[PDB]
Amino acid sequence: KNAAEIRQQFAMTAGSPIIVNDKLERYAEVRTAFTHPTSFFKPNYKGEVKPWFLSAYDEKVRQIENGENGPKMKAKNVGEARAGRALEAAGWTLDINYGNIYPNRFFMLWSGETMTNTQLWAPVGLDRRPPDTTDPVELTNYVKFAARMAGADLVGVARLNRNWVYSEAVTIPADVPYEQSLHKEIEKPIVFKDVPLPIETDDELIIPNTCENVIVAGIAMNREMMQTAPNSMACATTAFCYSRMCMFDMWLCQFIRYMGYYAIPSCNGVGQSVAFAVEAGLGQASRMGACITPEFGPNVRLTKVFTNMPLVPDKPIDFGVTEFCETCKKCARECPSKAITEGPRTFEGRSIHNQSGKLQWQNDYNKCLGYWPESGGYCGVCVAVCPFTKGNIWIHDGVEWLIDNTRFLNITEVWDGKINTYGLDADHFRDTVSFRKDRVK
Amino acid sequence: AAEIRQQFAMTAGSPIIVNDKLERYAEVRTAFTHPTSFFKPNYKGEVKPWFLSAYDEKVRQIENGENGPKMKAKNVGEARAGRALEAAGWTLDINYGNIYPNRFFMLWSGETMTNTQLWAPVGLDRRPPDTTDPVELTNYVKFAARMAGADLVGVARLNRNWVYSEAVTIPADVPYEQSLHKEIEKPIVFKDVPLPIETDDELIIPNTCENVIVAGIAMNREMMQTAPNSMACATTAFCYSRMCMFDMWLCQFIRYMGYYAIPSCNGVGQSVAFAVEAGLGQASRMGACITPEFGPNVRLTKVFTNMPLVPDKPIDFGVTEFCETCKKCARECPSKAITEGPRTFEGRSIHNQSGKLQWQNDYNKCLGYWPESGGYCGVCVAVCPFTKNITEVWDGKINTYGLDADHFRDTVSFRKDRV
Ligand SMILES: Oc1c(Cl)cccc1Cl
Ligand SMILES: Oc1c(Cl)cccc1Cl
Ligand code: SF4
Numbered sequence: 001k002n003a004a005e006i007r008q009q010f011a012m013t014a015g016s017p018i019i020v021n022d023k024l025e026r027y028a029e030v031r032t033a034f035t036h037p038t039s040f041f042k043p044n045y046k047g048e049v050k051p052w053f054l055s056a057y058d059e060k061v062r063q064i065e066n067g068e069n070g071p072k073m074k075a076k077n078v079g080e081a082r083a084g085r086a087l088e089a090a091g092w093t094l095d096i097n098y099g100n101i102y103p104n105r106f107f108m109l110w111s112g113e114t115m116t117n118t119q120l121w122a123p124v125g126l127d128r129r130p131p132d133t134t135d136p137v138e139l140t141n142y143v144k145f146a147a148r149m150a151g152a153d154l155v156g157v158a159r160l161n162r163n164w165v166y167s168e169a170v171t172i173p174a175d176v177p178y179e180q181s182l183h184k185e186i187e188k189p190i191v192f193k194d195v196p197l198p199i200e201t202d203d204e205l206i207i208p209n210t211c212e213n214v215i216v217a218g219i220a221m222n223r224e225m226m227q228t229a230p231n232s233m234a235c236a237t238t239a240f241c242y243s244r245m246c247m248f249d250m251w252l253c254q255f256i257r258y259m260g261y262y263a264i265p266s267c268n269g270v271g272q273s274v275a276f277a278v279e280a281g282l283g284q285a286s287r288m289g290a291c292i293t294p295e296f297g298p299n300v301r302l303t304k305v306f307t308n309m310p311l312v313p314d315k316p317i318d319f320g321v322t323e324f325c326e327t328c329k330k331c332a333r334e335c336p337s338k339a340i341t342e343g344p345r346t347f348e349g350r351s352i353h354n355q356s357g358k359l360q361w362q363n364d365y366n367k368c369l370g371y372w373p374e375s376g377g378y379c380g381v382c383v384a385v386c387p388f389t390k391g392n393i394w395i396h397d398g399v400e401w402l403i404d405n406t407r408f409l410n411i412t413e414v415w416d417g418k419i420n421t422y423g424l425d426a427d428h429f430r431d432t433v434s435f436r437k438d439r440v441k
Numbered sequence: 442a443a444e445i446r447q448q449f450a451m452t453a454g455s456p457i458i459v460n461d462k463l464e465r466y467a468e469v470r471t472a473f474t475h476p477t478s479f480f481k482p483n484y485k486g487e488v489k490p491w492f493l494s495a496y497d498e499k500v501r502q503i504e505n506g507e508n509g510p511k512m513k514a515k516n517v518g519e520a521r522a523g524r525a526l527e528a529a530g531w532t533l534d535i536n537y538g539n540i541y542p543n544r545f546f547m548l549w550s551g552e553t554m555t556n557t558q559l560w561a562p563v564g565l566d567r568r569p570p571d572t573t574d575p576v577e578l579t580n581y582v583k584f585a586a587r588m589a590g591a592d593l594v595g596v597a598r599l600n601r602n603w604v605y606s607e608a609v610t611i612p613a614d615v616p617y618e619q620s621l622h623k624e625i626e627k628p629i630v631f632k633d634v635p636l637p638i639e640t641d642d643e644l645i646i647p648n649t650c651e652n653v654i655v656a657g658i659a660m661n662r663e664m665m666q667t668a669p670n671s672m673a674c675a676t677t678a679f680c681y682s683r684m685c686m687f688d689m690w691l692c693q694f695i696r697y698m699g700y701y702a703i704p705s706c707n708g709v710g711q712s713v714a715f716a717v718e719a720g721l722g723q724a725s726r727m728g729a730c731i732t733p734e735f736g737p738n739v740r741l742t743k744v745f746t747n748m749p750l751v752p753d754k755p756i757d758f759g760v761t762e763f764c765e766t767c768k769k770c771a772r773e774c775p776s777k778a779i780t781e782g783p784r785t786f787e788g789r790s791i792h793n794q795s796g797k798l799q800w801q802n803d804y805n806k807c808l809g810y811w812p813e814s815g816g817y818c819g820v821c822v823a824v825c826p827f828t829k830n831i832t833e834v835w836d837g838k839i840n841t842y843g844l845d846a847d848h849f850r851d852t853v854s855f856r857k858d859r860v
């Protein structure tokens with residue numbers, strides 16, 4: 001199996017693959033089901049209406065008390081139930097309020113000047129010296145090498161399509177301390193202006209018009225843990241990867257800054273990761289709505305960094321995902337909340353949570369979020385059942401690579417079973433080896 | 442690899458031979474911190490803190506298009522990129538090694554952390570442990586350790602001989618910008634208290650703090666082989682930030698299981714001794730812990746806890762006898778810091794802890810080469826048999842976190858090999 005061959009075989013010609021029409025407008029981040037008032041509140045198992053994550057907390061507590069790893073899923077004993085939630089909670093250690101979405105706060109600073117690392121290194125002046133390399137070809141090789149050092153299992157580059165940048169971000173005022181953050185969230189416009197550096201004013205988050213490129217990283221989750229969806233160990237691989245995302249953004253932004261350019265981190269903030277990932281060639285959009293990659297299927301998290309560093313955009317990829325999703329529908333049939341549509345793609349949003357004006361399968365994400373308090377986790381059944389999440393999809397017929405159509409026709413054992421560093425799998429880790437030829441052409 | 446480690450397991454008992462002279466070692470005595478070794482001249486002849494003199498050499502090298510001492514880069518751009526990667530790798534590390542205990546990332550309680558506050562309604566850190574079985578806990582915590590980025594993990598009873606008698610730290614209210622100028626010494630003591638606690642006068646570890654969990658964090662072979670040049674600095678630096686994330690992740694897991702946990706990175710005590718007692722590897726002539734999987738090309742961090750655990754067995758795969766006749770690190774060392782002589786119980790200088798049988802090296806000679814070369818050397822690690830240009834590294838093989846898929850299978854783990 002040769003992942004590089006596969007990507008070469010299915011590479012497209014240049015151009016954003018996402019089909020759009022005239023009703024497309026940039027999307028206010030507050031509209032996501034996590035944040036919007038119509039979906040933010042959910043009942044707990046006692047019928048009390050709370051912020052959804054607090055209702056989910058109540059269900060986690062109830063499951064531990066009852067020795068369960070998930071809804072109606074008995075654990076080996078209470079200690080096993082306890083251990084799954086402890087692993088999940090610890091995974092979030094380097095993530096603020098589930099996703100690091102507030103731009104230019106906490107870990108997501110838009111300038112490195114106040115960071116302890118920048119201060120320590122200031123006598124070398126790497127962040128003030130003009131770039132010594134401006135060649136996009138060399139820069140792309142350098143920045144992708146750095147990206148792999150920084151924990152990315154996949155990395156791609158695209159020109160920044162502003163359609164996918166949130167019109168307004170969810171954030172907090174700069175004078176609000178952490179313990180009040182969840183009570184003091186606000187909206188703030190993201191605007192593009194003729195300014196030298198990313199800068200935040202009292203009224204606006206300002207991205208320079210020179211911010212040409214976006215670097216997208218894929219952060220692979222653990223197959224065995226995700227297959228326990230919707231139970232606790234799927235929550236744990238999700239959580240650990242959010243902290244890997246945060247480390248990646250900070251590492252990479254600092255490299256870019258020390259190369260003489262600016263860099264904006266984001267994790268789950270700033271813009272829509274799936275669209276950037278598609279335009280950067282990591283994978284294709286899917287019925288469930290995730291980016292499906294050849295290496296990991298949808299079982300991979302995304303983050304991204306925006307920069308004026310000259311780079312060579314990668315080519316999009318088309319390995320037949322749209323055509324398999326047309327006939328598969330497994331995620332839609334298994335979804336415990338019936339959130340995923342079984343119908344065709346449209347340009348018309350299903351509800352406020354969807355951005356209209358782009359051709360996609362339109363899913364009801366309030367229904368999805370509604371299952372999270374009920375199950376006490378982050379579900380993931382769609383990711384777990386997707387055939388592309390299986391590690392064994394690719395076959396070679398003597399001429400070229402193809403997808404095996406036959407693929408589309410417990411937690412104690414996970415704790416006692418195979419694991420490796422960062423939950424990566426040595427049986428497949430060769431798929432993400434990288435030489436210069438697969439970083440830049 | 443799991444076969445090899447079981448083949449070479451020793452019977453229980455610390456393999457470090459000590460005498461009646463041994464005393465705990467004050468952290469300020471390391472060459473990084475001690476007043477006799479801290480100040481070094483830069484290439485212009487100006488005496489500065491050693492790392493500021495090293496900074497000056499990094500700038501001079503970038504300006505001259507060099508990747509290291511007398512090592513021309515392909516161009517100035519390549520020189521710049523190696524130093525930018527090095528500087529970036531340190532992002533999650535305070536002042537080179539995170540040594541100040543109970544400051545910044547190294548908090549001895551989880552209570553004030555943003556993650557603990559967000560998770561407070563679940564009460565995992567306040568709920569008594571549901572598991573007290575050391576067998577099950579060893580399996581759980583080792584699984585978590587691998588999730589947290591350890592390539593190797595072992596457990597030993599805590600030997601207080603390797604805990605620093607006094608830590609280097611800063612006053613609690615000193616802002617970061619003044620930290621380097623306000624470092625102080627502070628005793629680490631053990632007392633009958635329920636939880637790790639810091640007073641004005643003391644860092645207090647509970648007498649119940651029975652165990653230490655030691656993690657090995659593998660460095661990249663291609664990059665370390667550029668020692669003493671900039672790409673060896675870069676793999677060193679990234680692994681320090683991996684160490685910090687490991688400590689915080691694992692401490693939070695242990696706390697959410699009902700126990701307490703003290704992170705440390707390069708602080709609190711001597712990592713090499715803990716790693717040997719936990720069975721990760723054997724002490725060596727250069728002074729590092731040599732592991733079967735990575736030789737010495739692996740960083741160490743460790744977490745201290747009262748969580749019940751099953752100690753691992755020390756390992757003997759012949760390192761002492763091989764180092765007896767090898768001496769390659771000693772012959773290649775650019776500062777002649779590593780001895781070609783036999784092991785003794787008497788240190789060569791203030792930087793060594795006397796009273797334990799080891800090869801005694803002159804660590805002020807080692808440090809003196811760092812401002813000269815503008816990096817963190819590592820030639821000894823690079824040339825060591827157990828470990829086995831810069832443009833070719835940048836254009837060549839890489840994978841996630843610098844790990845190597847040709848060897849990654851060696852660190853696969855099932856419960857059989859966890860406990
Ligand atoms: O994206 C997530 C957020 Cl923002 C919160 C909890 C779980 C997930 Cl997967
Ligand atoms: O341990 C180190 C410290 Cl403490 C500073 C710089 C480089 C290294 Cl390897
Ligand atoms: S489960 Fe099937 S329909 Fe759903 S995303 Fe995967 S391939 Fe597409």
Ligand code: SF4
Binds near residue numbers: 336338339369380
């Ligand atoms: S996460 Fe669960 S509830 Fe949400 S779309 Fe996927 S299967 Fe459905």
Ligand code: SF4
Binds near residue numbers: 773777779807
């Ligand atoms: S790091 Fe370099 S100078 Fe120091 S002991 Fe090793 S070879 Fe010698």
Ligand code: SF4
Binds near residue numbers: 728763821
């Ligand atoms: S180079 Fe030889 S003598 Fe030095 S640590 Fe390695 S095996 Fe031992």
